[PDB]
């Protein structure tokens, strides 16, 4: 019964960080659609969006 134990913590691993770039990359789509030219943004706006991720988590 221990075999599936170490199996799930790595499943806990490759499920959470990839959960994070799904957050950030999808946020680019809603930024990039209204402004096709603008993919760059200042430092504050990038990590003010990260604060939204922090509370959501």
């Amino acid at each position: 019964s221990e075999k599936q134990w170490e199996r799930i913590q790595q499943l806990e691993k490759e499920h959470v960080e990839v959960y994070r770039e799904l957050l950030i990359t999808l946020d680019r789509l809603y930024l990039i659609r209204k402004h096709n030219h603008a993919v760059i943004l200042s430092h504050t706006q990038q990590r003010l969006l990260e604060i939204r991720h922090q509370l959501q988590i």
Partner: protein
Amino acid sequence: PGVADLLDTDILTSPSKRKRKLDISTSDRSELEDYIVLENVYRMFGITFFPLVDPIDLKIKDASGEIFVDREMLGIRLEVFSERTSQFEKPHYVLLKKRIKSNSWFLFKHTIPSFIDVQGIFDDTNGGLVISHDDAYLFAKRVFLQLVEVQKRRQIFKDLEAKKIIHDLDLDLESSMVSFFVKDIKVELFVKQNEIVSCSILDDIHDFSQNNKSKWEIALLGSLDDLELKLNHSFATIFK
């Protein structure tokens, strides 16, 4: 919601749309299903050929990225059936490799026991080497003959023990040495392949005579299936 339109959540909406992203279709599985049942019916014969490839001799031409097999390999699978158990035994595998010089098959690896000389059977082939698939069939057919034959002498002796005609016995792998224990008298038999050639009664009783010993041994001689018929008649004379 705006991004939700551009992205496609269709695979979530319909479970049938989730499957191939995760993979065998129901039609393909059903179309494949009859094949496995067909293969089992084909294995009923007992002699089959199956493909094989050596992981080490594989090479790539690098012109198109395809993989070609350097030395072809052919495998033979042998299966036997038992009457009393009504189950298939452990299959025996014989594997053949092709020489690169004179394109002739030679014995590479075999799981046949030691007392069956598959190497000698291979050399009996007319040219001393197998050329076509039909030539290999004769070699495969004959090995299956002894495998059936050696097993054949085993279940018949066990059948007598099951019927409680005789007492406990011990026999070897080839079933040549069989301990015929039925009553106070002890008998040992030297049985040839699917034929009884020699028998030996060891115990001597005071009423038992040497002249009786000679004719009992001759009476016990005969075929293996006819031993049981002669078994009741001979022993009934002792206690009559």
